[PDB]
Design an enzyme around this catalytic site. Structure first.
Site, short mmCIF file in Angstrom:
data_model
loop_
_atom_site.label_atom_id
_atom_site.label_comp_id
_atom_site.label_asym_id
_atom_site.label_seq_id
_atom_site.Cartn_x
_atom_site.Cartn_y
_atom_site.Cartn_z
N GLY A 1 28.21 -23.27 64.48
CA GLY A 1 28.37 -22.88 65.79
C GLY A 1 29.46 -22.15 66.07
O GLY A 1 30.17 -21.98 65.35
N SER B 1 24.71 -23.30 68.35
CA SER B 1 25.23 -24.49 67.63
C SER B 1 24.37 -24.70 66.41
O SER B 1 23.12 -24.27 66.39
N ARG B 2 24.76 -25.05 65.44
CA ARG B 2 23.98 -25.08 64.06
C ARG B 2 23.85 -26.45 63.71
O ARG B 2 23.23 -26.61 62.68
N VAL B 3 24.40 -27.31 64.63
CA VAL B 3 24.03 -28.68 64.43
C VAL B 3 23.37 -29.25 65.83
O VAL B 3 22.62 -30.01 65.75
N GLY B 4 24.06 -28.80 66.88
CA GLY B 4 23.48 -28.72 68.34
C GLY B 4 22.95 -30.12 68.58
O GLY B 4 23.54 -31.21 68.48
#
Lengths: 56, 62, 499, 470, 50
Positions: free
Chosen positions: C342, C366-369
């Site tokens: 993120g 966001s890579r998990v978001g």
């Protein structure tokens, strides 16, 4: 006093219309207003002659 | 130990008596007595003003 | 009195240099004493000089060990004995640090005395393994509407905060902390995020402003400020995030949750650069040490959501990187960008354009978001991403004779942007985030005049608070928006919107 | 003489290595004096290289040095004299008068290095300076005890800006000031001496309300580095001992960075990024941290910064950019447009600008001004290619207000009686908020753009409207 | 008021230089001999306790 001064000033704007060459209506009005506002803030920034002699 | 020797002597034998009022005075603002509210004097004198104001007004419409 | 101080010195008696190894400085220049002795010496061991200076031993050279001084040069002079503390760098860790401003060594710089810390654990400790982590599923709420919906943040998760210098970068961070007070007040240690702000290279005057603001917002009582100020020495500055992480580990290890904001790693980098250059170790790309990647990654991987066998706890983290005039390409930004999962990218234009705080959510990712997001907030915020996306495209078509479709988009988008303005140092609760976004989503704010968006927002909140505090309580407790709740909510929104 | 006698071993410019004998080895940061027909060469001890051979940096010139020359140890960081009478003395780097008013009367002496004060000492600022300069007052108000930072390139008459500040803030203020010049021209030195003798800030009869420390660029680089520290300690004596509030002024701090870079190279510390010293951060840090509002005194530094080729992304300005409280960027471009102050308003922000803190009304007005200006700058591009025809009536009104505001900011200064002739317009903060508010309300959008140009407040703008009218 | 508070702080520093004077006395006295002998025998005892 101050409210009288300004009421008469605005009356004087339309009086200054009556005679062309007015340039000292402005000198009277500006001068009384300027020093009035200065003395009024002087009076608002008045610190009476007092000092600590109890706390300090 | 050595600390104790130094301490015993120091605390017991050395005490400072507070500095003179003058030394404190020097290190603080001194204080001086000002004078007058202001003395101005009367404005324009004589009929110089009187004549000037009546005459000078020529700010009448042309 | 004089007695207490003397008695303190007397307490300070005890002498004997009976130590298996002592050292003697050979030459001391540049804060790099090169010591002859210390044959036994752990790697990066803490060593105490004659001048009481503390050091670490980055270079163990074959005949001399080049201690790096954490203290002032003036005291040190060649030849001087170098006592061996015999303990690798460790800092007290424990529950005492809650509401404590501590310097790197741990010494309270708020003078709240000795820490009630129950252990000293090393500065660098290897990160949780594969199985010591469970997938994230608990969100944290910053009280910033855009961040919580557009850029949802989990727990045990690290998303970057990369943005322009002194644009209240610290302010963006501080807002999150304020919302954590509300949650902190609440029970369950997962909800009690004990925030840690790591003030790196920040002048004591600035940190004083922080301390007072934090005290004003009562934040000190879960807050920890690990402080390595501008004055504090480059070893202290270097080890400051590492040290900080360890404090976090105690909370995390106890299964509790916490949020650590490393601010800013850019100045940490500079300190490492200073160390490397002084140790003559070659500086990496863009003259920033080569293994800075390894250091930063090690630090940032000690923030994680632990597994349930590891006591269901976490250390959420939010590193801050200061851009060099918006330069996101540069060795330290590129490296960090790779490490982080993120990014939040604040946009200067937006700041000037009155979105203060300013965030540009195009360049936030966001890579998990949304994997950790409030379920309620998911429902009412898919639309918002898409609407804003369209708004960006039709932004530049806002310069005459406009198609109705574009113009409609433009109207919805402008109102949304105004709605998403954040008033600094005022956080919000999710139970009040969702109604506002819901209105916008239902396009009931399309009609509301732009000037009146601001007025609408607060008014709507008060209207909801008096009239529909059942709805608010339902939103708060259910955590999900039931169709019946959305029905009633829509009705409420319509009614308020009508006035 | 001193048992601590050292013999020079290598003159390698500023790096001069001395060979103190056995059982004697000055501590780091000491001050050595070497008797010379050039007086006393002062050497700042900066390393020990072992075998009782130290490596020291010269402050004064290094010509005519003969190896094996006896070196006395004065010890500790160079200790100047400080005192009540330091005001009205121009003092060179080694703490000796350079205004030939004879030896400075020492009450106390102190070392020029002094430890930064702890977190506990710091007291949280909130006082608002009012310079009476519209751009500063409205769009980035200053704070007393501040660390104002005059970022700009050359050409913007950085010294001139400071001169206006001295005229306004210093004269108004009761506390003393310290004017410190780091590596600045002897043309500027002579001008400053004359100018403040004239303005009576330096009043040779009686004392002065300022002390001066002129360090000039001809002075060897070592001295250029350590002039700043010296000036700071004089301020500390006022701040601490005399319990005063000091208006510190320093000029130009790029010279401080630059100086340190040179002696880093000479010290053998391989040049760090963009050739700047690896200890840049800590040197900057030491200077800024030392300055603070202690309980004994509030010190307001104003530090000039030279931004090479207007790239403030260059590490030396960029590092300073963090460290200073109240940035202002004086852009060359804006100066060229004829707007004096040359401050670029959208590139000038201060920590003290917080809404309610600077007044909620003040903030809102200033926010409206900023948006208006920001719109105007963006719309210039639209006007450039597309033309002004694609701007709506609303956009056009915002542009007209911005053009008026842009030149409403333009006002003369007392120090451009010299440059021009127009006497400065000291326009109070409260008056400025009102005057700018009026414009936004459109009450004086019936006044021509050029009657906003290079004049004072709203009353004056009306008067100049009358002047253009007839 | 400022110097009044200051004098209390200053006094400790005044008393500090008096310790130094007392140091010059200690190292001059046959405390220099006798207490150094005390340090010697104490050190012998410490080193014996190893």
């Amino acid at each position: 006093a101050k409210s009288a001064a300004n009421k008469l000033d605005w009356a004087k704007v339309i009086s200054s219309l009556r005679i062309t060459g007015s340039t000292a209506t402005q000198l009277s009005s500006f001068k009384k207003r300027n020093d009035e506002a200065r003395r009024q803030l002087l009076e608002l920034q008045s610190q009476p002659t007092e000092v600590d002699f109890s706390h300090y | 130990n050595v600390i104790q020797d130094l301490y015993l002597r120091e605390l017991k034998d050395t005490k400072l008596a507070p500095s003179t009022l003058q030394d404190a005075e020097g290190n603080v603002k001194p204080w001086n007595p000002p004078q007058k509210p202001n003395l101005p004097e009367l404005e324009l004198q004589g009929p110089e003003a009187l004549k000037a104001y009546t005459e000078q007004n020529v700010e009448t419409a042309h | 009195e004089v007695s207490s101080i003397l008695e303190e010195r007397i307490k300070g008696v005890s002498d004997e240099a009976n130590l298996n190894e002592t050292g003697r400085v050979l030459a001391v220049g540049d804060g790099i004493a090169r010591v002859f002795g210390l044959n036994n010496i752990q790697a990066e061991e803490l060593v105490e000089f004659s001048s009481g200076v503390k050091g670490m031993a980055l270079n163990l050279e074959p005949g001399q060990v080049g201690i790096v001084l954490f203290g002032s040069d003036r005291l040190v002079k060649e030849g001087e004995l170098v006592k061996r503390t015999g303990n690798i760098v460790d800092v007290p860790v424990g529950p005492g640090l809650l509401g404590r401003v501590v310097d790197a060594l741990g010494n309270p710089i708020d003078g709240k005395g000795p820490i009630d810390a129950a252990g000293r654990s090393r500065a660098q400790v290897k990160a949780p393994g594969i199985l010591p982590r469970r997938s994230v599923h608990e969100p944290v709420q910053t009280g910033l509407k855009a961040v919580d919906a557009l850029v949802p943040i989990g727990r045990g998760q690290r998303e970057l905060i990369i943005g322009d210098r002194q644009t209240g970068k610290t302010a963006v961070a501080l807002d999150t902390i304020l919302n954590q007070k509300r949650w902190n007040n609440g029970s369950d240690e997962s909800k009690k995020l004990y925030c840690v702000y790591v003030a790196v290279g920040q002048k004591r005057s600035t940190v004083a402003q922080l301390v007072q603001t934090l005290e004003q917002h009562d934040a000190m009582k879960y807050s920890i400020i690990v402080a390595a100020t501008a004055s504090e020495a480059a070893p202290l500055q270097y080890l400051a995030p590492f040290t900080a992480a360890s404090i976090g580990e105690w909370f995390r290890d106890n299964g509790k949750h916490a949020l650590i904001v490393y601010d800013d790693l850019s100045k940490q980098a500079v300190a490492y650069r200073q160390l490397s250059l002084l140790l003559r170790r070659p500086p990496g790309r863009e003259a920033y040490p080569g293994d800075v990647f390894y250091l930063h990654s090690r630090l940032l991987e000690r923030a994680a959501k632990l597994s349930e066998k590891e006591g269901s706890g976490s250390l959420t983290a939010l590193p801050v990187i200061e851009t060099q005039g918006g330069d996101v390409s540069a060795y330290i930004p590129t490296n960090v960008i790779s490490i982080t999962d993120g990014q939040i990218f604040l946009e200067a234009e937006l700041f000037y354009k009155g979105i203060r705080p300013a965030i540009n959510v195009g360049l936030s990712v966001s890579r998990v978001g949304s994997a950790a997001q409030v379920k309620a907030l998911k429902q009412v915020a898919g639309s918002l991403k898409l609407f804003l996306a369209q708004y960006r495209e039709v932004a530049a078509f806002a310069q005459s004779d406009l198609d109705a479709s574009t113009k409609q988009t433009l109207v919805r988008g402008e109102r949304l942007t105004q709605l998403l303005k954040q008033n600094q140092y005022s956080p919000l609760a999710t139970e009040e985030q969702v109604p506002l976004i819901y209105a916008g989503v239902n396009g009931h704010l399309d009609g509301i005049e732009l000037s009146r968006i601001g007025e609408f927002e607060s008014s709507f909140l008060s209207y909801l608070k008096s009239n529909h505090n059942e709805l608010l309580t339902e939103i708060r407790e259910k955590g999900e928006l039931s169709k019946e709740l959305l029905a009633s909510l829509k009705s409420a929104t319509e009614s308020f919107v009508a006035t | 003489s001193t048992p601590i006698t050292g013999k020079v071993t290598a003159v390698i410019g500023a790096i001069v290595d001395v060979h103190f004998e056995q059982s004697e080895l000055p501590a780091i940061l000491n001050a050595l004096e070497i008797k010379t027909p050039q007086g006393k060469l002062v050497l700042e001890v900066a390393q020990h290289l072992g075998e009782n051979t130290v490596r020291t940096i010269a402050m004064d010139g290094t010509e005519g040095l003969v190896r094996g020359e006896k070196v006395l140890d004065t010890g500790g960081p160079i200790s100047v004299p400080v005192g009540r009478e330091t005001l009205g003395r121009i003092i060179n780097v080694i703490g000796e008068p350079i205004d030939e008013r004879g030896p400075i009367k020492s009450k106390l002496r102190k070392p020029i290095h002094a430890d930064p004060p702890s977190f506990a000492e710091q007291s949280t600022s909130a006082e608002i300076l009012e310079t009476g300069i519209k751009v500063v007052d409205l769009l980035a108000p200053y704070a007393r005890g501040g660390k104002i930072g005059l970022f700009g390139g050359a050409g913007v008459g950085k010294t001139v800006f400071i001169q206006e500040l001295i005229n306004n803030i210093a004269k108004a203020h009761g506390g003393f000031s310290v004017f410190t010049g780091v590596g600045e021209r002897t043309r500027e030195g002579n001008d400053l001496y004359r100018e403040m003798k004239e303005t009576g800030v330096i009043n040779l009869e009686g004392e002065s309300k300022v002390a001066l420390v002129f360090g000039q660029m001809n002075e060897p680089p070592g001295a250029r580095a350590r002039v700043a520290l010296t000036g700071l300690t004089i301020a500390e004596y006022f701040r601490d001992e005399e319990g005063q509030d000091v208006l510190l002024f320093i000029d130009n701090i790029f010279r401080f960075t630059q100086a340190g870079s040179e002696v880093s190279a000479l010290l053998g510390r391989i040049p760090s990024a963009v050739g700047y010293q690896p200890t840049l951060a800590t040197d900057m840090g030491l200077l800024q941290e030392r300055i603070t509002t202690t309980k004994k005194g509030s010190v307001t530094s104003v530090q000039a910064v030279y931004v090479p080729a207007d790239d403030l992304t260059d590490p030396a300005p960029a590092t300073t950019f963090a460290h200073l409280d109240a940035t202002t960027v004086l852009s060359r471009g804006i100066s060229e447009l004829g707007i004096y102050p040359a401050v670029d308003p959208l590139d000038s922000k201060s920590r003290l600008l917080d809404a309610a803190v600077v007044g909620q009304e003040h903030y809102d007005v200033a926010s409206k001004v900023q948006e208006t200006l920001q719109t105007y700058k963006s719309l210039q591009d639209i006007i450039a290619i597309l033309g002004m025809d694609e701007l709506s009536e609303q956009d056009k009104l915002t542009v007209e207000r911005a053009r008026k505001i842009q030149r409403f900011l333009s006002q003369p200064f007392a120090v451009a009686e010299v440059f021009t002739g127009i006497p400065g317009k000291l326009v109070r903060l409260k008056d400025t908020v009102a005057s700018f508010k009026a414009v936004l309300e459109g009450k004086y959008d019936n006044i021509p753009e050029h009657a906003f140009y290079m004049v004072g407040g709203i009353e004056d703008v009306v008067a100049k409207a009358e002047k253009l009218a007839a | 008021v400022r110097y009044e508070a200051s004098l209390r702080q200053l006094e400790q520093r005044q008393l500090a230089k008096s310790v130094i004077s007392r140091v010059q006395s200690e190292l001059g006295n046959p405390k220099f001999q006798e207490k150094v002998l005390q340090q010697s025998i104490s050190e012998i005892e410490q080193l014996l306790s190893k």
